[PDB]
Amino acid sequence: MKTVITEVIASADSQGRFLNNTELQAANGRFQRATASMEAARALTSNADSLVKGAVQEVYNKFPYLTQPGQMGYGDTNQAKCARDISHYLRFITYSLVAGGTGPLDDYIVAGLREVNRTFNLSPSWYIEALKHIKGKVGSQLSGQPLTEANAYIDYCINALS
Amino acid sequence: MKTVITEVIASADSQGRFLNNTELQAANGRFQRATASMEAARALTSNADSLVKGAVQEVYNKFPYLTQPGQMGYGDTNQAKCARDISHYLRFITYSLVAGGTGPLDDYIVAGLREVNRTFNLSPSWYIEALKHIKGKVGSQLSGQPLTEANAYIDYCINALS
Amino acid sequence: MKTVITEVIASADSQGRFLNNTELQAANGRFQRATASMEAARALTSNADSLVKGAVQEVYNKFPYLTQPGQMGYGDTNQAKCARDISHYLRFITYSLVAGGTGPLDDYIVAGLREVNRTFNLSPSWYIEALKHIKGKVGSQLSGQPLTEANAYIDYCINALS
Amino acid sequence: MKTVITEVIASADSQGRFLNNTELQAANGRFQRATASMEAARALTSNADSLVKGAVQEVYNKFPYLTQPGQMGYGDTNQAKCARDISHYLRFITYSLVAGGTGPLDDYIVAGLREVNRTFNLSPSWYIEALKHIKGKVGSQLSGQPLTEANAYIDYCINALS
Amino acid sequence: MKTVITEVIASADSQGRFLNNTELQAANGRFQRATASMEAARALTSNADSLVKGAVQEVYNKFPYLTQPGQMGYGDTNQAKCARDISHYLRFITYSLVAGGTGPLDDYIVAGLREVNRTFNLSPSWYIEALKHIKGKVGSQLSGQPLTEANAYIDYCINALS
Amino acid sequence: MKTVITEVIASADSQGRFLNNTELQAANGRFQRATASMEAARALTSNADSLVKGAVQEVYNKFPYLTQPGQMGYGDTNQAKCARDISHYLRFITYSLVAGGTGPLDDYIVAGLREVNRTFNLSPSWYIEALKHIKGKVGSQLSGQPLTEANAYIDYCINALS
Amino acid sequence: MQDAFTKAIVAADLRGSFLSEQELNQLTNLVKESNKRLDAVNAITGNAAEIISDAAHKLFAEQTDLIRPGGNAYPNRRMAACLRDMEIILRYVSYALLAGDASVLEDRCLNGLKETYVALGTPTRSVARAVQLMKETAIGYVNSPSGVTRGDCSALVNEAATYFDKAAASIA
Amino acid sequence: MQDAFTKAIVAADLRGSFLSEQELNQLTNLVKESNKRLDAVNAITGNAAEIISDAAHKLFAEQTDLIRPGGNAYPNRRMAACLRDMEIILRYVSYALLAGDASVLEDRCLNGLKETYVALGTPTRSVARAVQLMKETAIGYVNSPSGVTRGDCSALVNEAATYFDKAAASIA
Amino acid sequence: MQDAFTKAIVAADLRGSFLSEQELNQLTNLVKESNKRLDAVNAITGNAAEIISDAAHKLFAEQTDLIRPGGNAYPNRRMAACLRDMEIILRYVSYALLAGDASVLEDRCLNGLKETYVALGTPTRSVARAVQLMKETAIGYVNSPSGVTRGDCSALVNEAATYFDKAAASIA
Amino acid sequence: MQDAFTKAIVAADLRGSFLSEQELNQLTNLVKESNKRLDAVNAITGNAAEIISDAAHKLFAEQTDLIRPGGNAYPNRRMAACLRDMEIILRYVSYALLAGDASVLEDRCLNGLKETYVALGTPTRSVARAVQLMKETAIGYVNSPSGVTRGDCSALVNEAATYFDKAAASIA
Amino acid sequence: MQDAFTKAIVAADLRGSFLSEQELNQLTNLVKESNKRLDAVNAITGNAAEIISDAAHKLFAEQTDLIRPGGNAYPNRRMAACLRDMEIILRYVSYALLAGDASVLEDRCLNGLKETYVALGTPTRSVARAVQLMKETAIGYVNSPSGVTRGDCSALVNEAATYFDKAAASIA
Amino acid sequence: MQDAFTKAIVAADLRGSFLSEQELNQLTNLVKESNKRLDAVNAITGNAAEIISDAAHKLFAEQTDLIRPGGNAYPNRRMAACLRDMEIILRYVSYALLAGDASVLEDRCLNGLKETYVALGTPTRSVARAVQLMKETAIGYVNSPSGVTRGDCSALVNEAATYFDKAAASIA
Ligand SMILES: *[C@@H](C)[C@H]1/C(=C/c2[nH]c(/C=C3N=C(/C=C4\NC(=O)C(CC)=C4C)C(C)=C\3CCC(=O)O)c(CCC(=O)O)c2C)NC(=O)[C@@H]1C
């Protein structure tokens, strides 16, 4: 699972080599950065409930037709599975924040994304728009390096979906 | 040439991938660490002259017999090439300090070391003892994270020679 | 370019082998089948104009919102590039009919499809719906083995897009 | 075992792909061709007895010396093993006719042929002459596409032995 | 070209290694053996004319039918090309004797033998019988280790042809 | 284990080939050479005791300082392990003499030598000087091809250590 | 690899015999029904994506545990693997259907498959079910297609079923 | 790889057009003559060994220098290479003949071939001749075979010749 | 591979010298501006897809010949290759920007690239233009981002431009 | 591969939950002690050779049978293999120590190791002992280094010990 | 790989000793008989093809079931495999005979061989017999060759037999 | 690969002839001097390391620019490459000396070597000199060795020189 720590260890191992000053300098970055990351994580964690309901709705407001009958934003089950899915994304964003890398996102959401979305007729556009909205609101929950971190990972998901 | 920057870029490139938060966190470590590194570098740089003469002599004081006739610590040319060689090591230590990794040491002294030393009848023990001495004196030129950095690289050379 | 003829030749060549009765039997299939294929081709060729306008419109009738301002079924250029694109598909369908295999479709539309559609924000759903409509109308232009052929290739495109 | 059916399936599988119109066209060739093939098969099957005795004798008539003492066309066991061997060839010819490809010939007679014949001092010339004779007589048991099929496979054996 | 000398050199080179006592011992064998080899070579060289005419005839005496019209031991050109071919074999036998290995035989007669003989309808049996005869007569031109050498290489050709 | 016999067999096996005159000539070298080799072996075997004590001492006489306190030629255990080590070398020299190749030396002393010597702070110079001395004295125990053999292997060890 | 003819040939050869008039006509009948067979294979190819998709939707409708954390079709990576396996099995079933013999299915797909899944912790009973759903829908398509000549395809629908049922049995 | 249809398609596409009624009927005619084409390809396959052998016998009959020491078809190794090349070229000519297009021949066989032979010291004029002899005999067989229906194969015999002539020209 | 420090080191070594106080402070300044540099690299990474997409839309808006048959961004296969190359170049430009040195860009991407495109028939002037458009948009993003501390990034915007301009020059 | 954070994340995900305030602060503490951790990993790296050498000298001091003929650290080839394994294990212990999790050690080094040694005839009890000696000396270095700020490293010394003890237990 | 000398050396080393005067003279005797040994190996090489052929003719004379359909030396492919194995075993027996030690035979040929054949359904008792026949004929040749100096080769004929008998025993 | 005999054979064959009595006795003489040849090859093998070392010491004594920064035998990596090349060339010279023919040297070592060095910026004149020094010392050893029987080795010393001189000429 990709973190700064696992990456430097992987690179050492693959050259049959003890960790050296290059690799320990790298690790210090990840540790120095934890405070901002983890502040973003705590804010995203406690606002999760509303961030999810905000983004879910915004998918319907931007794609009005989704909420008409015969469509995929209609009925309890679609709308339920949607909230859940955005919640999955926010969850892995917090994990990536806490972990010090994109690993959790890469392993649990990015690997396989398109195949799944294509089989199930899920448009990335919705998910990008959910995330664009989450990005708008996270502008006033955080600032400074915690915001930059939150942004880094939200944007990472948006690029994964384009 | 191995630095934190080149390492993360190499790892991105080899997966066909833009630099992400994992890789930029790593880079911040290298940049945050530059101050201590570069203080060590400046101190080792201006004391070079005496650090070299100190270590050269210590090789003869620890291996007295080297300075007798018919031996490899005798005559102007051996003793000249010795000072030069320790000077090469200190030079690459400062480079490794400034560069943010072992690259300069790996590329210019470690790659090929044993083959060369073995063909020319140069014992690593001398060089370890030169470096052990340099390590003793650098104890009072630096302290805190600049000393730790100086140590990291001196020790790296000693392990390369064992 | 994949045809029955190229496939059997490829398989012979790769075993360093003259064409034998297995491979010539195969070729006879492709030649025996040409009549139905080429009837489908001629019918799809002369109706092209209307098949394209029919499918283009159906994309807007099934996705009404596309034709509102700020959307991708609005303005002369989007609607022009759409007709063109369906026309490309029908063109390659006729080519695949005439060629005796999916080659023209594989090489000119399938290879790269998703990457392109994803960069340009083109939903496969439109294209599937264009093709589903074309399939409805081709029900009364052809029958028997020419219809089966037309169907084979239309369906092949729909699976390429799912 | 090489048949038109196995070949197209092999080619699909190796590209991780469902059978498409290219592959089904091929299969139709093999099925359309079965009637001529199987007529050849039935004629070769019921005449087997005499086709074999005819070819066996012709080997001795073309290589008179074989039937003298100390030679390999002398005594019950050589002459018995000869009839058997030509019978094996005709048997696999009928199988190849019925199967829709050279597979049975490739797997049971061609793979290993020369090594065996070389260890046992069996000249291909005999076998070619057995087959040339069988080809002469099959000229009046069949005609049209059944004869072409019979010929295809007899000739295939003669080329395998040259 | 395979000789004891080339073999040991090849084995050294492929391990990036100077020739050592193992390899020089080997070479001494080849040099110690040269006297017997070269005696065989001189005897086979001066008797070549008759050894060839003896073996050529023996091919016709053992395969009487070859010399009848319509056959491959008939007419000046077949009988000429035969003498030549046995002469080629004796020539390479002398070369292999002189060279200290099978190289000349491997490179100029064995590599490709069967393909050529099979395309041109040349039976190995003739050539084996030519060589069996040459082996009979060389029994009284040589003895001791020169005969053993001559035999080694004649037998090597006979095994190449079986 | 590298001997002339194993080498030629290895080379045959790897080409899927019976031993031929090239390989048997090689073997004769190894067998012809056994007498000189085994005379060297017997002389080195019975003089072992003194050859070892002679070389051990010479290491101290050439590196006087080794025998001072705090050094690696001091105390019963160092001086004991030294005699043992030279004894190992002479032992494998006799084995290489008897075996007809460097195998015993390659497998039991050369493979791994430098890594071991480097971890344990053992200078090759000592061992070269032990062997140079053994080479001096073996000048008057043997002569002719037994001396050449003894020399071959002593020198082989000296090159392994440079 | 075997097809229905090749199978006949192997059994004949083990007797040392030219094909029996029995076996000949069994194969003449396979040629007789081959246009229908081509339509049946074509029915599956032409709806492969929907067959997998529809099987899938229904599998997870029934077994909502697979798509929870802890479940074998969670997260995206695992769902993609599961969707991929559905395709692989549907693919080898279609190959068997063109061939008139199960061997390609048994040899290239089913052989070892159960033990793979158990090693992985993949619930074989759920995989068996996904195969049962593919069967329902696939046969649906074999039976009700675009302007094919009307006739009786039940023999072929049975045979297709046994290939689906082989796979299910082999895996559960 | 191209065949005669694929070639049509590529030219049509470069216009941005559905195939012209011109091109359609040219291809309808190729389908019209396809049984003859299959017999023509079959004529070559069924006599490949003799075509190579007979070409060979005659090549060395004419050019007795190749089989002397110093000659490029001496010793056995080189003769086997030369016999092998004769087969390779006859093989790609038969592929072109099934395809109705020279491209497989030009792309997989003829491209670079001359420069290979010159690098090797292989006399290209002799290789060209061996190809001319294969042509004579191959066409012989295309024209006079076992119980094929009587008709006119001259169009196909020409086309086969141009493939032999392409190869010759490309190599000499 | 070089970065801005490594470059200093190589030049120092070629003199046989410890780094000059000149060079030391040039590198101290790079460390001084490194937070800005990280934001600049982050600006590109965070908008890579849009940078490529927007460059693309505009390239084909200008050069409608590339998307006609006969054109080098037609059919889908070629467009995907062109979109892929846009990404590859944007990627190595971002690497150079993290490094403070063009070498990774020149050595792994630009070296041989022009001759590749000419061999392929890819119009280099169009590729140069696509690079110019990526530059415009990329710098746009470097200059106007999400809640970054306000300051002056013009030095870094220039340096990024020279990497875009190197690539353009190298290719056209 | 896991580190201490990644481990937290995997357990959270198996609940379907954002990290507990419990788990958050456990990880905040790991960040709190991370400078000490870096010194501890650095202590091992900076003395790797001596740690192996000193362990080695002492292993063979105790077990003089290993360096006799018949013994598993005889002749030079085997001693080099044994010295190499000492390094490999010390290496994965240092990786675990940077990571705050044993998994890299267990997965890349310890998994299968015992069965390897038994197959080889390598006395596992001697290997376990060599690991115990590396532990003594390694921790020695973690506790008494060059001008590190004075404080309490016992928590980290324990954790390092458990990695040495895992390896020993796994192997003996 | 071992030969008779190498074997001596390994046993000596396991004692920590220079070779015993016992072992020395045993090896002096091997050198004494080495010309005979070379003739014995040469006897096999010089008649390899006939040894295999004659063994073969006789194996199938006895066991006419192997060459019926259903039999393990039917069809041509299997007979070629069986002829090939006869050669492989005769080859490693000749290697052992040059070496004065069975190890190359046991390690490269016999190790696992029985279990291979059982997996394949190859009747091991028939393979054992084919080896017994090769032995009879091979020794025949070792004993009655072309103008070799007259003497006693029974010691070597025995030793060759034990290599044939090892193989037989190992396989049956 | 050629040796002196193989060379004779190739020239004979190009005439279509059995070896001339001329050529026979030239080769009889090579066998006559072969013990001396073995000592000469042994002289080089037995002092390879010193020959390279001594050549090296002297090369850099003369050309102190190579060991300055900017010089082609600086830093350690380049010196090791240069020492390695000295060994490689000495190795192929010894092979040629065992063979009595330069071909292995020319074909495996010298062919392309000059153009390699020029591409690399390696000063060929310095490499030529290093080869001249190896020659001086190597021949020194060929002429003054350990208890070899006294005689005249000048013919062999010349021939060894021409191999050293070939290499030098080829490289400079
Ligand atoms: C010139 C090449 C020779 C020649 C050919 C010729 N062929 C036919 C007719 C047919 N040939 C076939 C052959 C095949 N069908 C297949 O599926 C395969 C692959 C296994 C082959 C080889 C068939 C089916 C026909 C039609 C049936 C028939 O026998 O008539 C003709 C007749 C005209 C036509 O185009 O059908 C001719 C003239 N004729 C010659 O004289 C040349 C020596």
UniProtKB/TrEMBL annotation, chains A, B, C, D, E, F:
One of the protein's GO biological processes: photosynthesis
One cellular component (GO) term of this entry: plasma membrane-derived thylakoid membrane
Residue numbers binding (2R,3E)-phycocyanobilin 2: 82
Top-rank taxon: Bacteria
Entry binding sites for (2R,3E)-phycocyanobilin: 60, 81-82, 84-85
Main location: membrane
Location in the cell: Cellular thylakoid membrane
Source organism: Gloeobacter violaceus (strain ATCC 29082 / PCC 7421)
Protein name listed in UniProt: Phycocyanin alpha chain
Sorted UniProt keywords: Antenna complex, Bile pigment, Chromophore, Electron transport, Membrane, Photosynthesis, Phycobilisome, Thylakoid, Transport
Pfam (any one): Phycobilisome
Organism phylogeny: Bacteria, Bacillati, Cyanobacteriota, Cyanophyceae, Gloeobacterales
Recorded family membership: Belongs to the phycobiliprotein family.
Protein's membrane topology: Peripheral membrane protein
Gene label: cpcA
Family matches, as Gene3D superfamilies: Phycocyanins
TrEMBL record, chains G, H, I, J, K, L:
BP GO terms, sorted: photosynthesis
Superkingdom, natural source: Bacteria
Protein residues bound to (2R,3E)-phycocyanobilin 1: 35, 39, 149, 151, 153
GO CC annotation, single: plasma membrane-derived thylakoid membrane
Residues where N4-methylasparagine is found: 72
Annotated (2R,3E)-phycocyanobilin 2 binding sites: 72, 77-78, 82-88
Keywords: Antenna complex, Bile pigment, Chromophore, Electron transport, Membrane, Photosynthesis, Phycobilisome, Thylakoid, Transport
InterPro entries given in the database record: Globin-like_sf, Phycobilisome_asu/bsu, Phycobilisome_asu/bsu_sf
Entries under SUPFAM superfamilies matching the protein: Globin-like
Subcellular location per the Swiss-Prot or TrEMBL entry: Cellular thylakoid membrane
Topology in membrane: Peripheral membrane protein
Pfam families, alphabetized: Phycobilisome
Family named by the database record: Belongs to the phycobiliprotein family.
Record protein name field: Phycocyanin beta chain
Origin species: Gloeobacter violaceus (strain ATCC 29082 / PCC 7421)
